[PDB]
Write a structure and sequence with these properties.
By secondary structure, the protein is of the alpha+beta class. It has a single domain, classed as Cathepsin B, Chain A (Alpha-Beta Complex), CATH 3.90.70.10. Helix content is 23%, strand content 21%. Strands 1, 5, 6, 7, 8 and 9 form a six-stranded mixed β-sheet that branches. The protein has a two-stranded antiparallel sheet with strand order 2-3. The longest helix is centred in the N-terminal third of the chain and has 18 residues. It binds the ligand *C(#N)C1([N]C(=O)[C]([C]S(=O)(=O)[C][C]2[C][C]C(=O)[N]2)[N][C](C2=[C][C]=C(F)[C]=[C]2)C(F)(F)F)[C][C]1. It is classed as hydrolase.
């Protein structure tokens, strides 16, 4: 039995919404967001982790292209291989590709492994969000409606399961009979509901939200 609604922000496991700017680092923000929650659950401290560290260091060897895109899963593996990721405070976000400047003296978190959920299973995603924590996911954000979203439960008739934008599911619930996934984006506070978007849930893997979900563990 799972709770009807979940919001990890109530549990103090979600940091301030970030602004990626003109740099395509959504994948990096998605990954650090997921790990930030695990760090809070393990140490009791909520700390924004360095998305820049991922953009600059989890590069070619991880199939990523910095400001031109990347994978949340390979980002997690980089953190594992590297034995750490720096804090955002020590390695600030500059919205541009830079030479890797990771330094263990600024390490704020570690990762031991990550898990990728089965393709398109929203019930499994619900279970992970309820029992494990925020989950990194990709969504189809190639439609105007996504950019113009302001409030309520987002539903786009033209959405597909071909995902291109990395975000973070930090909860789920329902608005007047309409089920949704609570998603943290990285487009600043002017986007949607002050940085968040509630996307249609249990509507046939709408916009591919449950297509490629993953979460790290410490
Ligand atoms: C953001 N900002 C942008 N997107 C990405 O970096 C996406 C993130 S995603 O959640 O869509 C990843 C998933 C995994 C399976 C899939 O098809 N998308 N990654 C893209 C990407 C990855 C690697 C690369 F070198 C360039 C792009 C994607 F979608 F093609 F995989 C806008 C950057």
């Amino acid at each position: 039995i799972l709770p009807d609604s979940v919001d990890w922000r109530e549990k103090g496991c979600v940091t301030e919404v970030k602004y990626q700017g003109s740099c395509g680092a959504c994948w990096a923000f998605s990954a650090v967001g997921a790990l930030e929650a695990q760090l809070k659950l393990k140490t009791g401290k909520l700390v924004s982790l360095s998305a820049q560290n991922l953009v600059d260091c989890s590069t070619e060897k991880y199939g990523n292209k910095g400001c031109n895109g990347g994978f949340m899963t390979t980002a997690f593996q980089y953190i594992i291989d590297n034995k750490g990721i720096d804090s955002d405070a020590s390695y600030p976000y500059k919205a541009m590709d830079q030479k890797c400047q990771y330094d263990s003296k600024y390490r704020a978190a570690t990762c031991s492994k990550y898990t990728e959920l089965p393709y398109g299973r929203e019930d499994v995603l619900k279970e992970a969000v309820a029992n494990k924590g925020p989950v990194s996911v990709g969504v189809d954000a190639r439609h105007p409606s996504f950019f113009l979203y302001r409030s309520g439960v987002y539903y786009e008739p033209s959405c597909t399961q071909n995902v291109n934008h990395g975000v973070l599911v930090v909860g789920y619930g329902d608005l007047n009979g309409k089920e949704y996934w609570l998603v943290k984006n990285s487009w600043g506070h002017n986007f949607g509901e002050e940085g968040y978007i509630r996307m249609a849930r249990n509507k046939g893997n709408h916009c591919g939200i449950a297509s490629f979900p993953s979460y790290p563990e410490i």
